[PDB]
Structures are given as C-alpha cells and as structure tokens.
Amino acid sequence: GSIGAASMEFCFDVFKELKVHHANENIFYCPIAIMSALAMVYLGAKDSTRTQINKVVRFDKLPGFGDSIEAQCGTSVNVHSSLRDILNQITKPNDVYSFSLASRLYAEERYPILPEYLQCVKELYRGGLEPINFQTAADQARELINSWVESQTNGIIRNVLQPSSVDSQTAMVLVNAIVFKGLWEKAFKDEDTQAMPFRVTEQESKPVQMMYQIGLFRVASMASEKMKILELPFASGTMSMLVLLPDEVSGLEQLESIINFEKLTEWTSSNVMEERKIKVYLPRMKMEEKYNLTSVLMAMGITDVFSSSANLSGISSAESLKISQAVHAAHAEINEAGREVVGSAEAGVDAASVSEEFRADHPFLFCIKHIATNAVLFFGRCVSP
Amino acid sequence: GSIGAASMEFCFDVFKELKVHHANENIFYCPIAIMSALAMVYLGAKDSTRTQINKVVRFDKLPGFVHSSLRDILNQITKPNDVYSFSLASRLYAEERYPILPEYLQCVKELYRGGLEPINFQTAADQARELINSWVESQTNGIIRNVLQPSSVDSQTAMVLVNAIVFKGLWEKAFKDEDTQAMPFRVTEQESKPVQMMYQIGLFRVASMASEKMKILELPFASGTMSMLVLLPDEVSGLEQLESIINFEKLTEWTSSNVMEERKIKVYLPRMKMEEKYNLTSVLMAMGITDVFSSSANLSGISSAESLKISQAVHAAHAEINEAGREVVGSAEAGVDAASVSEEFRADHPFLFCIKHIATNAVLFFGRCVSP
Numbered sequence: 069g070s071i072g073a074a075s076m077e078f079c080f081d082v083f084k085e086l087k088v089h090h091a092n093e094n095i096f097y098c099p100i101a102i103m104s105a106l107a108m109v110y111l112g113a114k115d116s117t118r119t120q121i122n123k124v125v126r127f128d129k130l131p132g133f134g135d136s137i138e139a140q141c142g143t144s145v146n147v148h149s150s151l152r153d154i155l156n157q158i159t160k161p162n163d164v165y166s167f168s169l170a171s172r173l174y175a176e177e178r179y180p181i182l183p184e185y186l187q188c189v190k191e192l193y194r195g196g197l198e199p200i201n202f203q204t205a206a207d208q209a210r211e212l213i214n215s216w217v218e219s220q221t222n223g224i225i226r227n228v229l230q231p232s233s234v235d236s237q238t239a240m241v242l243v244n245a246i247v248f249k250g251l252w253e254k255a256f257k258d259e260d261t262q263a264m265p266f267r268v269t270e271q272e273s274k275p276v277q278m279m280y281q282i283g284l285f286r287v288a289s290m291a292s293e294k295m296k297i298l299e300l301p302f303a304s305g306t307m308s309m310l311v312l313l314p315d316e317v318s319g320l321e322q323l324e325s326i327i328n329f330e331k332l333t334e335w336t337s338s339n340v341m342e343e344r345k346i347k348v349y350l351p352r353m354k355m356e357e358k359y360n361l362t363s364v365l366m367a368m369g370i371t372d373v374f375s376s377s378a379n380l381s382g383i384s385s386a387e388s389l390k391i392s393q394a395v396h397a398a399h400a401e402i403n404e405a406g407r408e409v410v411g412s413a414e415a416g417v418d419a420a421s422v423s424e425e426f427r428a429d430h431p432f433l434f435c436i437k438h439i440a441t442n443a444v445l446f447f448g449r450c451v452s453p
Numbered sequence: 454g455s456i457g458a459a460s461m462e463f464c465f466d467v468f469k470e471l472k473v474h475h476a477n478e479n480i481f482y483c484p485i486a487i488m489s490a491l492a493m494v495y496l497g498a499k500d501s502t503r504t505q506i507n508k509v510v511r512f513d514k515l516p517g518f519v520h521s522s523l524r525d526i527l528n529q530i531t532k533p534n535d536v537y538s539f540s541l542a543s544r545l546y547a548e549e550r551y552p553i554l555p556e557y558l559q560c561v562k563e564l565y566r567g568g569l570e571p572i573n574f575q576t577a578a579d580q581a582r583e584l585i586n587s588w589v590e591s592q593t594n595g596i597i598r599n600v601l602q603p604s605s606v607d608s609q610t611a612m613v614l615v616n617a618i619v620f621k622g623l624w625e626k627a628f629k630d631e632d633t634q635a636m637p638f639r640v641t642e643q644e645s646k647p648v649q650m651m652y653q654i655g656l657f658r659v660a661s662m663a664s665e666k667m668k669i670l671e672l673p674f675a676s677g678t679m680s681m682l683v684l685l686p687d688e689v690s691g692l693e694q695l696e697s698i699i700n701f702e703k704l705t706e707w708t709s710s711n712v713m714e715e716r717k718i719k720v721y722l723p724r725m726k727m728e729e730k731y732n733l734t735s736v737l738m739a740m741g742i743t744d745v746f747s748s749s750a751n752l753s754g755i756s757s758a759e760s761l762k763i764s765q766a767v768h769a770a771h772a773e774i775n776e777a778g779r780e781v782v783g784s785a786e787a788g789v790d791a792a793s794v795s796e797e798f799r800a801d802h803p804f805l806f807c808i809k810h811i812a813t814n815a816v817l818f819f820g821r822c823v824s825p
C-alpha cells in the first residue's frame with residue numbers, strides 16, 4: 069500500500085513470531101532495516117523465491133517495487149523509492165540524531181555475480197554485495213565480516229557472526245546491523261534521574277536509573293484496555309517514541325495479544341490523543357538484541373531462499389547460491405539528552421500543580437516512528453532496561 | 454590557491470604552535486574540521502576580526518570565498534559510505550538573548566550542519582554546559598564526553614565554539630588479528646612500552662630519504678579516497694629535527710611519485726587510539742587571531758548585539774587505527790612473500806602521521822605518536 073502501513077504490518081508479523089521464542093525478555097529490532105536487507109535479495113530473486121518474499125514482506129504495491137520498474141534498476145531513480153527515501157532521509161548526516169546502517173550480502177567468491185546486479189545493488193543500496201572466500205578461509209571470512217560491522221557501527225556492534233556460523237560450505241551471508249541515537253525535543257535533566265525500583269513482576273524488582281521531567285506531551289488514556297500511551301518527540305520533529313504502558317505490572321500479555329496496525333492507528337489517532345502537562349518517569353535504557361533471521365522468516369513463510377530450491381538467477385547463474393545465514397542486530401540507547409529544558413521555577417510550580425503522571429516502572433512496549441509516513445523504525449518490549 | 458595547499462599550510466602553522474605547549478605528548482587534530490568552524494565565524498565577521506582570520510587561515514585565496522572548495526570535501530567525507538565513518542559535531546552556541554541576523558541563520562543552515570544554536574548562559578550556565586556536553590556525546594555515539602569542564606561557562610559567556618570529530622576507516626589491505634602481538638615501543642631509548650603491534654607484508658608506496666634520515670610509508674584506505682602517510686625517523690630520537698623541518702613544501706617533495714615507489718615490505722604499525730582535546734583559544738591567539746575572543750570582536754554579520762564574542766573554543770578529535778580492512782592476503786601469496794620479502798618498515802619508535810584526501814590533497818588529520 070504505503071510504506072507506513074507495510075512496515076507496521078511487517079513489524080507485527082515479526083513480533084508475533086518473536087514473542088513465541090522470547091518470553092520474559094527484552095525484544096528490540098528495526099523493521100525498516102530488515103525490509104531493506106530483503107529488498108536487496110528480492111532484486112535478483114525469481115519464481116517462488118520472489119513470491120514468498122513479496123507476500124511476507126509486503127512489497128506488493130509499494131511505489132518502486134514492480135518488476136517493470138525494477139527492470140530499470142541501473143538507470144532509474146524511481147526503483148524502490150518508497151523504501152529508499154526513508155533510508156536516505158534517516159542515514160543522512162544531521163545535527164539531532166545519528167543512524168549507522170551496516171547492511172551487506174557476502175557471497176562466496178567462487179560464485180560468479182551478474183555484472184548488472186552488482187551495479188544495480190550498488191546504485192540503490194550501500195553495503196550491497198561483497199565477494200569473499202568462505203571456501204578456503206571461513207574463520208578469516210568471519211573476521212572480515214565482523215570487523216566491517218564493528219567499523220561501520222563505531223565499535224558498537226561486535227561479533228555479529230559467532231564462531232562456526234560460517235564454514236567451507238557457506239554460500240552467502242546476510243548481515244544487517246543498526247545503531248540509533250537521537251536527542252529529545254525536551255531533555256530530561258541529569259540531576260533529576262534517580263535510582264527507583266523497576267517491577268519486572270509482582271514479586272520482583274531491580275533498581276534502575278529512572279529519568280524524570282514534567283512537560284506538555286501527547287497522552288491517551290484507553291480505560292477500556294487499561295493502559296496509557298505517551299508520545300515523546302525527537303528533536304527536529306521527524307520521529308517520535310510511543311510508549312504503551314499497561315496499568316498492571318503484568319498487563320503486558322494482554323496488550324501483546326491484541327496490538328496490531330489497525331489498533332495502533334486507532335489508539336494514536338488525533339481523535340484520542342491530547343496534549344497535557346504530565347510528570348514523566350522513563351528508565352534510561354540500553355537496548356541491544358541480535359536475531360537469527362533464518363528461523364524467523366522461515367516461520368513466516370520465506371523458505372526457498374535458505375535452501376537448495378532458491379532461485380537467485382538475478383544474482384548468479386551458479387545453481388547453488390542460497391542464503392546460508394541471515395543476522396539482524398539493533399542497538400539503541402535512550403537517555404536524558406535533548407534540545408531544550410524547562411526553567412527550574414517553572415518546574416517547581418508544575419511539581420506543585422501537576423498530579424497526572426506516566427510512571428514507566430514496569431514492562432512496556434515502545435515504538436519509534438517516522439512521523440510523516442507513520443513508518444516503524446524501531447519496535448520493542450522493555451522488561452529489563 | 455587550492456584547499457590542499459591551504460589545508461596543509463594551516464595544518465603546519467597549527468603544528469608549530471602545539472608542539473611548544475605539548476612537548477613529549479601525542480598530538481592529534483583535524484585541520485579540515487577546524488577550518489570549517491572558522492568559516493562559520495568568518496561569514497559574520499567584519500573589519501579587523503575578519504581580516505585576522507583571513508590572514509591566518511588564508512581564506513580569500515580559495516574558490517567560493519558558497520565555500521565550495523571547503524564544503525565539497527566536507528560533504529563528501531560526511532556522507533554515509535561502506536568503507537569509512539566520519540562523525541562531525543560542529544556548532545556555535547550563542548546566548549539566547551542575542552538576536553541572530555536572519556541573513557546569517559538562513560545561510561549557515563544551508564552551508565553548515567550544526568551551525569548556530571541559542572542557549573541560556575545568562576541564568577543557567579551549569580545547565581547549558583550539560584546540554585552542550587550531552588549534544589557532543591549524543592552525536593559521537595558516546596565517544597567524546599565532557600567537552601566543557603566545570604566553570605568554563607558562566608553568566609558572562611557569549612558564544613561557545615565546539616568542534617568534535619570521530620573517524621574510523623577500513624584499510625584496503627587488512628592486517629590479520631592473529632599477527633598482532635606485544636612488541637616494545639621505544640618511547641625513548643631508555644623507556645620501552647608494550648604495545649599491540651600490527652604486522653603484514655604487502656605492496657605499498659614507500660620512500661626512503663637518506664638525506665633526511667627518514668622513511669615514508671603510504672597506507673591506502675579502502676576504495677582509495679584517503680591514505681595515511683607514516684613519517685618515521687631513522688633514529689629513535691630523530692623526531693625533533695624532522696618536526697623542525699616539516700612544512701607543506703617539504704611534504705609535497707617527500708611524497709612525489711618520482712620519489713615514492715611500490716615495494717613489497719614487512720609493515721609493523723601499532724594499534725592506535727588517538728584522542729586529544731585542545732583549547733582553540735590559546736592556539737588561535739598565538740597564531741594571530743585575537744579580535745574574535747575579545748571586547749573588540751566585530752561579529753556584526755551574526756548579531757547586532759555589541760557584546761558578541763567567542764568565549765570558549767574547543768577542538769576534539771578521536772580516531773581508532775586497528776587491523777580492520779577489506780582484503781587479506783591468501784595463504785599461497787603469504788607463503789611467497791615470507792620467502793622473498795626482506796625489507797621492513799617497523800614503526801616502533803615515535804613518528805608523525807597524516808591522513809590525506811587523495812583527490813584534493815587536503816589534510817584530514819595530522820598527528821605525532823609518542824605513546825600508542
């Protein structure tokens with residue numbers, strides 16, 4: 069449809085799969101980065117390999133994804149526009165946030181690559197495709213890969229490929245790693261951050277650095293679902309963080325069952341949300357998770373790429389090229405830093421007068437979105453900040 | 454006449470000043486980033502203030518001086534790419550009570566990332582200090598912390614210049630992890646220090662300057678837009694004479710294509726984590742830029758307020774040099790090299806180094822390594 073709708077539906081499909089396998093843990097991933105890793109594959113994919121991707125990853129009627137347009141890969145700025153526009157906007161140097169994307173296919177050097185796919189994927193994608201010797205020097209190849217990621221991510225994402233996840237037999241490895249740091253519009257003051265208990269369960273607490281401010285924020289109270297949603301804008305008005313906080317320390321299970329694109333949209337509508345002065349408590353958070361994309365996508369219906377049945381004819385003519393490993397790694401730190409702070413006097417008066425709070429001191433969901441398109445950039449479950 | 458020559462000459466005039474005040478230390482700074490901060494200032498400076506900068510920095514000379522010569526390279530090096538990363542946090546913070554000329558703001562926005570940011574120094578200088586240090590820290594993925602120390606800002610601060618940069622790049626030719634091991638680095642000929650010494654054999658441009666009693670090695674980064682030059686004196690203690698002599702003219706000579714030749718060579722180079730911060734005020738003042746820091750400043754292109762001056766100017770540079778690269782030697786080739794290659798470049802005592810931009814010949818970073 070549109071990139072907003074497509075990333076969100078994709079996001080909740082992945083979430084359904086991951087919540088299976090990661091109960092009572094933090095979850096954090098970047099749907100947009102995953103989409104762009106797969107777009108790259110999609111480009112050279114054919115037949116059933118291609119149709120599986122399209123159905124799962126929602127590529128269908130996005131602007132810039134048709135086979136007619138794709139055919140023009142080398143020579144047209146329209147190809148994959150809908151996705152490339154967001155990546156381009158978020159990866160550009162700027163003064164209020166930083167994204168680092170390290171996303172690449174590593175292909176065994178013995179397989180011959182179509183000159184006109186290398187060119188295509190280089191035009192549209194950064195990282196693209198890189199040839200490498202798995203056949204005679206896997207642990208070397210693994211070191212190369214790891215050290216490219218660590219370099220492109222400012223040393224943050226280390227040992228993306230674990231030992232003996234490549235070997236002489238590896239054909240092609242997908243690597244997709246992302247770091248984000250942004251400033252709030254309204255900073256929390258460091259002096260206001262305090263140790264407070266985070267209630268993981270009813271019967272269990274862990275002390276965390278809890279940030280605090282009073283400010284004018286958009287909030288919705290969904291009494292029917294027993295929850296509240298807060299929106300915290302990032303500086304320069306192109307992204308925001310939504311935090312979905314169940315009333316009860318263990319209301320998460322329910323929310324996770326019901327949440328979907330339609331529900332998120334309903335809950336965050338103009339209609340429902342209103343700007344109020346509120347006391348905000350939010351943990352400082354350092355989210356980092358790494359997922360095996362093979363297991364995930366394969367439960368979702370993408371199977372051919374990872375096997376003998378792969379048709380990647382648009383990439384190599386070499387019959388046996390498939391995806392051997394596919395990893396996603398996402399890192400974000402959430403802390404005080406922002407552009408503006410309220411005067412003290414103001415806050416003292418506020419303190420006195422404001423009674424409503426949003427106290428995120430128990431598990432919550434969060435989503436970072438691009439405002440304009442409603443694209444989901446990051447989605448997570450915070451159980452242990 | 455070009456950004457290459459201006460950047461080089463600027464670089465070595467700074468070096469002449471830092472080398473006095475920073476004896477026996479590591480030195481490391483990014484001349485291009487300093488020049489672009491000064492360009493942001495220059496734009497609103499008038500009169501003597503402006504002239505002082507132009508003399509020292511050698512702007513009038515340059516194509517676009519909008520600022521094409523300088524902007525072209527900044528834009529190229531800051532764009533995302535798959536071989537290197539440069540994070541620039543460069544910004545003027547001006548006390549929020551000073552009205553900023555619309556002309557200026559529009560124009561800095563359009564030429565310079567970061568540009569100019571109003572802030573409250575007058576009644577909340579401690580808070581303002583936190584917000585400034587938090588912005589650098591946020592923008593450098595946590596790498597440069599604490600750019601301003603307690604009491605560097607007060608109710609009398611007008612404008613603070615903040616110019617921070619982080620670099621990380623892949624070599625064309627990777628060193629292997631397994632080849633790095635501790636070797637003695639001769640700080641002096643009485644004092645050794647265990648460092649992680651990287652090792653490889655490969656084909657590199659090298660110049661041996663008998664006259665000068667030094668060798669020059671060039672190590673390309675992947676996709677050859679940038680190289681590091683290592684300038685290694687013969688004698689453990691020959692660094693003093695070299696730093697005495699080096700300047701634009703000399704560097705150009707020593708690295709001409711007459712002079713440099715590609716040989717197969719054993720390279721030993723320390724893993725390096727370079728990070729330094731400088732008070733730009735003391736530097737600049739000694740070079741001849743005094744007005745901008747003073748009562749007499751004329752920055753009337755920025756603001757009408759007459760107390761506008763730069764109160765604090767800090768440069769911070771961080772670069773990690775390690776084994777990471779794009780391509781490694783094959784075992785077969787490695788076998789041959791080991792049998793054939795005898796000559797070495799062993800960077801096991803203090804050396805100068807330069808990272809340059811290949812097409813414009815501009816200096817990106819300049820350093821002295823005494824202590825890896």
Ligand SMILES: *[C@@H]1O[C@H](CO)[C@@H](O)[C@H](O)[C@H]1NC(C)=O
Pocket residue numbers: 230233360361362363364366393
């Ligand atoms: C990824 O998951 C698949 C299971 O679908 C498994 O075959 C493969 O070993 C996994 N890779 C790693 C790194 O565990």
Ligand SMILES: *[C@@H]1O[C@H](CO)[C@@H](O)[C@H](O)[C@H]1NC(C)=O
Pocket residue numbers: 602605732733734735765
């Ligand atoms: C920087 O040096 C200037 C000029 O010598 C000095 O007045 C100022 O105190 C120094 N700044 C800091 C932060 O030390």
